Amino acid sequence: MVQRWLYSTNAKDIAVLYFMLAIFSGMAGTAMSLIIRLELAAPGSQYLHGNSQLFNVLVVGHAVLMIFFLVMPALIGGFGNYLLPLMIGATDTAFPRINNIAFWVLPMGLVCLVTSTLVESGAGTGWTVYPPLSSIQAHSGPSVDLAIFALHLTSISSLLGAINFIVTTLNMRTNGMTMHKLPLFVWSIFITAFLLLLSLPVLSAGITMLLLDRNFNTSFFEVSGGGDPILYEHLFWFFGHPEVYILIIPGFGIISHVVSTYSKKPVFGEISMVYAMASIGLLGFLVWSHHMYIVGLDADTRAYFTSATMIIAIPTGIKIFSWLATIHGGSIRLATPMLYAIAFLFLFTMGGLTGVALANASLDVAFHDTYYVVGHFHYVLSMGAIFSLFAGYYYWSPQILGLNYNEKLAQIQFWLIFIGANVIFFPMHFLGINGMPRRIPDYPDAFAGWNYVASIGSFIATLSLFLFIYILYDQLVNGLNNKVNNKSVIYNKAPDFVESNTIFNLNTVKSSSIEFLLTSPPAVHSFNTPAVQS
Template identity: 65%
Template sequence: MKQMSYMTRWTYSTSHKDMAMTYLMYGMMSAMMGTGMSVMMRAELSNGNSQFFHGNNHAFNVIITGHAMAMIFLFVMPVTMGAFGNFFLPMMIGAVDMAFARLNNISFWCLPPGLVCIMCSVTMENGAGTGWTYPPLSSMGSHSGPSVDLAMFALHLTSISSLLGAMNFMVTVFNMRTMGLHMMNMPLFVWAMFFTAFLLLLSLPVLTAGVTLLLMDRNFNTGFYEVGAGGDPITYEHTFFFGHPEVYIMIMPGFGMMSHMMSTYSKKPVFGEMGMIYAMGSMGLLGFLVWSWYLASPYSNMRKKLNFAMCWKDLKQYSTLNSKNTYCYIQSAGNQSTITYIYTKYILLYLYMVKMTSASETTREMSFNFNKFHSFYSYLFHKKDSLPDSWTIWFIGFVEGNGAIQSYSNNSKVRFVLTQKESNILYLIKNNLNMGTVKHFPSSKSNNKNDFYRLMVDDPSHILLLTYLFNGNLALNHRINQLSLWINILNKKFINHNIIFMNKPVNITLNDSWLAGFTDAEGYFNTSITYNDKYKFSHIMKMRYILDQNDEIMLNKMRNLFNVGKVTFRQKTNFTYRYTMTGLKSMDKVILYFDKNTLYSKKSMSYKKWKEMYMKIKNKEHLTEKGMEEIKKMKKQINMNNSMSNRTGKAKP
């Protein structure tokens, strides 16, 4: 029999061990390429100035795209699934080889062309600087060259390889087990590979279909994602994020490896093996629902609430299942002698990182981030307890409506100013923040109706504290622009702090007190009663919730939050915009919000009377003469409080 040459053996081999070695060598080559790109990125980020790309931001995006695709699709998946899976899985279940040996060879040889395509996409023309290939950034209008097409071809090739390998693994587990080895008796590594193959088989076809439609948009004039042709880019987000189990595809083989190592070095079976099997299976199933949690924002209000509630609960359930795995690993570690093994130390360090990451995931529901503010507040005023987040968010909303982030003396000094007719609210803010002085500005007229008060903060340390509070937590664009100038001045003055400006507005929701603060500054509750000439003793009663603001975009966001009301332009009052909610049915949403979030100005008195009036009208007490008289008295009190609490003497922003 003629002996095979060295090249023939490794090219046409169908042995699962030989294929594992080829996967491993290929993965190491891809890892070196991805690591080289990572070094280039870190060299660029090592200093504030451009160190490596000399201001070519697109080249940086190209390197990020190539690095991500190389490390995920060409290194992590081939090594965990192809190398470790091919080598150990047949031996662990007593099989001679994989179920489809030639298919195993074909699945590997789909990968080298994928590596070539990714290298060409990085180096050809301007490169594919698309990140995760989201349209319209990846459409022909933004990337007209062949680089993006080559990146998508690489995704197709790696997807074909993974699908063939997944089918091979699942059939091997089902049909190639040795006599007497039942499914529930298989090692945890085999279960991990089985669940990973299951996730690949379900998620990759959807991901590949989304990429294929994008490829057709680019080359065959279809309009699946092109807005001008009637398409919707959000569709790509759904198809792409349905492949979110890719995250668990990368980590689940690691669970299997750690289980095997723990069992080997502790010299005893893994603790809670059956629970870990159910936990890994449940993590795989729940991973598909996380797609909806990520894409809750494009939905309408009702669907958003439903999907977010279901999938936030799903994410917490996933964290619980992950905790089950962690607990089992710690129990399996055994006595102190086991901890001395370097492998066990790495595993315990990994478990610590996983738990810290899971803890950070569950705290991302809030839009605001006050960590820097709270720590500096405690340091500055020597207090263990900082301000409650509800009041802090209210204060930010109040400042965005009625604050002034000023710079003066040729942009060399900064100052913070709040102006109000009502002094009590300014003293409340001063006492809570422990900063600033309140000054009284009397009017020139004999009456004091036009008097106003100002809270002024000039102290540098207090200004720095407010900067930490506002940075990254503002919603209005013009306030963010003011803060940007403020931070530039502070960075020149306090060189050791080097504050990084965050230019992203927060998302305002009805789940925090921002709108309550904004209402204390810019809003009010209004009622009107007019006689109806058509009917005797008949009145037309209107209840309104009103917000005045120069920023039309913000008022439209408020309208979208409540899903009711209208925004109008008021040319007579300094070219401002007004958001108005009318109608008794709409007031239910307003009352539901302000019952949960406190108003601190005199508008709280207006709101209480306004709500009381609403309840009387809802209970039809206005149909009686006595009830109507009470409603008229409430109307006068509400409108009088509004005139007393309206601000004046607004400081220049």
Template identity: 65%
Template sequence: MKQMSYVTRWLYSTSHKDIGMTYLGFGMLSAMMGTGMSVMMRMELSNGNSQFFHGNNQAFNVMMSGHALLMMFFFIMPVWMGAFGNFFLPMLMGAADMAFARLNNISFWCLPPALVCMVCSVLMEQGAGTGFTTYPPLSSMSAHSGPSVDLAMFAMHLTSMSSLLGAMNFMVTVLNMRTMGLHMVNMPLFAWAMFLTAMLLLLSLPVLTAAVTLLLMDRNFNTGFYEVGAGGDPVTYEHLFWFFGHPEVYILMMPGFGVMSHMVSTYSKKPMFGEMGMLYAMGSIGFLGFLVWSHHMFVVGLDIDSRAYFTSATMVIAVPTGIKIFSWLATIYGGELRLGVPMLFALGFLFLFTMGGLTGVMTSNASMDVAFHDRIFIYYVSFFLYTLYNMYNNYTNNNTAHKGRHCANASYNNDINNLVSFMDKNEYIKMFWVGLMDGDGSMQVNHWRKKNLQYRLIMKTSNLESNYNMLMLMAKVMGGTVRISKKKDNVMWVVDSKESIKDMMKMFDKYPLLTSRKMCQINFMKKCMKLNYMPAEGGYPREAGTDWYLLNRNYKYNDQLNMINTFNLKLKNKSFMNALPEGHGMHHMVKHSEYFKCWLSGFMEAEGCFSIRLNKSNSFSMGQNDDFYLMEEIKQFFNATNSVRNSYKNFYCLEIYKRIMLNNIITHCSNYPLLGEKKESLMKFLK
């Protein structure tokens, strides 16, 4: 089958990840355009007099309208729902793709023509200076007679169509595409946020479409739905627009609530406090959002009873919102807080969102709203941007984080970035890798028809997402490839390039292996490589490496012979002993160095075990064949009082269960983080 071209892939793709990335690129383009308009507005307002528009107030209004429509309909909605939703929701559901893959593609391709209409609306004639609400009669033919407002209406129609198709797709995916055993109540909060947002879109967008369609008919077909002289009422448009407009606020914010919950839980190393309460709070916010639209219209002449109702209903929304704020704070409280960049953004969000919510409670009072109506501080700076701008910050922060199994291990990088400042991240990974090799690695020398020797370094772990990400991180720094076994039960890191292995031999000189078995393997490999690849330097014949390998290969994995280097024990087979360098033991400088601490984390990743016993007590254990003295050194490092015991055929095990000593292990893992499956075990252990 002919491979798709680059252009064909992105134009016709039905992959949820590809479509998510196209949404992301489209959102970034729209954001740059909207930001440019915002900069022009701010430059104009930088001084009391007209700075750049030379008194052309219509041009300023056009910039304001274009900025608002671009940022809401072309940036935040496509990025939250289209990019984040498409990319992550199927993975969170355990689904292969979205329910309607082709519909997903169509929903995206409604947006580029909408953007063209929006840009033309800004540029044609005098532009659409109506504000993003497009209230009549300002948007009627008497005030804007050109095509600009019509083009803005067409753009809103197309974005509404895109969002409706996407919302139906999201809802069907959540309802029908969940993996076996995943019930609705057990879904992640981000998945629930997407589902509730899709419901809000499905219920509110048809009302906006109807309002805009009636406005187009008034402008082009001489109807009088909003024309007072023809018996219409412009306030009808306001009711229709704000019936969509207030749920739109939660459409923009609810995906951010889901992302926020995951960020706080991850960086506090605790499960979300009151997860069901958070779920009901999101549902309550969405439901109440449809009941409070007229608080945007307190100055149009509502009767006193309507004002009282909408004031009370608006204040009630503060209750589920407060539940979410306090649940986030309760999750942070008592957690093992890690102040990575995403967590700093989350803390900033908490402050800004709380401030924005408080100003919302203040202006929900009809009397206060009338007094502050049309004031830029309350409506634009204080309330609107406090609540929405921090959502933009959360987006930009999360744009590169946690892109699933195949995306460069952002969470592991964050762990490593929190190391002591004087340690280079790549150096930590190398030292960690040596410890992992000591535990799970294998250094293989094999022959092909007794002629050529083949060399491989292999590290094999169970096929879990955390282990896959860890090995991908190793491959990024060390080289090599990561493969999944045919039976899908193991994931392996493999290096079989001669040059790469030579480079790693030099690294083992800098960061030595510490277990006797692996030291024996590495020295056996070095001897074979020396005889095989450098015969002229040593005066050996070219076939010396193969001959020496065939003579001594039965000794390389013999447990009784693995003590030769670490503890200077005597070996009966003198010819094999002469082929290996003298043992160096574990020098006291190694035991107390940063290298040993980093090596130990890698070794714990391979050989450690965090356990929760039947009596609910915690314990940590690790063991190694033959290396009694190495286990003694680890015991002394953690100040453990337990004895290293010989559990079975020279397998020496160290088990720690006293709280003080366990705290030493936890502190060590905080400073020198685990990166794979044992990291997840530690998280459960801490809970």
């Protein structure tokens, strides 16, 4: 099986491997999140006997893991390399060895990340790796070096995945797929590949500059030598906000592809949807100065950047209102992917309104590095990543794997993670609105009630994840019995109202893309004949 998996070239096996690494690293990220909430549960360092360096190490570990090693290799990696060759009807992705090196350079990033945590001191700097905190004076030991190499390896993997995706969808469209007729998730992967290609070089440049300052006695950001850390702040957020819009774009694609097939009607204005995706993508670049309104930017600079980062809420609102039109006037067959898309809609709307309250520079003077920015970003990022990920998994898993999850377990998993996520990230709005600073292991002795109910909510969400990995085992060893007996939902799109049962039995799958017509778990190199389209 070494020939099938280690030497692998096909898109489906690499995508399954991407997904397995995503579940592993996401498990490690939520365990780091669990210890973060455990030490944060009561005022004082209860569990970790002092040692705030371990708390900052676990903050950067949680951050780097659940951005670069769960959401990126999940959405770009697994669902990308499984559906972008298949939804366009390509046989396999072009440049396949590049794709295999992208996936297999990810766990080397994971190995050097866990070695960065394990090695002598520990990277206690946060996922913003700001100097002089990341200088050699405030951080000896090669821990920041190994975590920076982990960030570089993930940059290499996401860059190779993005260039592979953009050439595979720019050249291997099948016999009818003009660019106006592309599926919506394909457009989302194309847009985020374009954004990755136009963003990740600046990240690699800035992190190499930080390494040259840290180990080679140069003066880029250290003040003793003329440099300034404002240059690292500019470069890192010029990467960082395109990074998080890259995290949110295939979420929009997967949610649109769930809604437009569980509401049995096509998406409202696919051209307006892809222009909204292009607008939010290109406007993720020019608002990169919103992360440092505190830093001392001028009056005209801040007043321009707040107007841009509040005008970026127009295309996202176009997407939300088009989604509400797509659910309006359908037949909302409330299965688990539709449940995840509904709660994604509501929760992402609440988080986006928190962000647009955060965006004003006259209001950011009382919110930056409080827990209000933590509320906005954990809401938008956690919901529009994890909820979209669960929607994609429960939406494509009988198609891409060929088994069947239990249905009642899937719905209680959704309800547990929804009430857990709501009850954990709603109090952080209050803790930020009354001034609790970021990245504290010990806190003022007034915040104990909300920082206790937040640690209740983390336990609820971790119980939802343990239920999820029970569902995974049940799907893997009882999928055929779930197909036979009445547990799962076999036919995803319901029969329409005047449609009979025999007619539906001959016409079972009515999708708007290829892959739902593909066989359960699909043939290894399908499209022996090129798939033609009108």
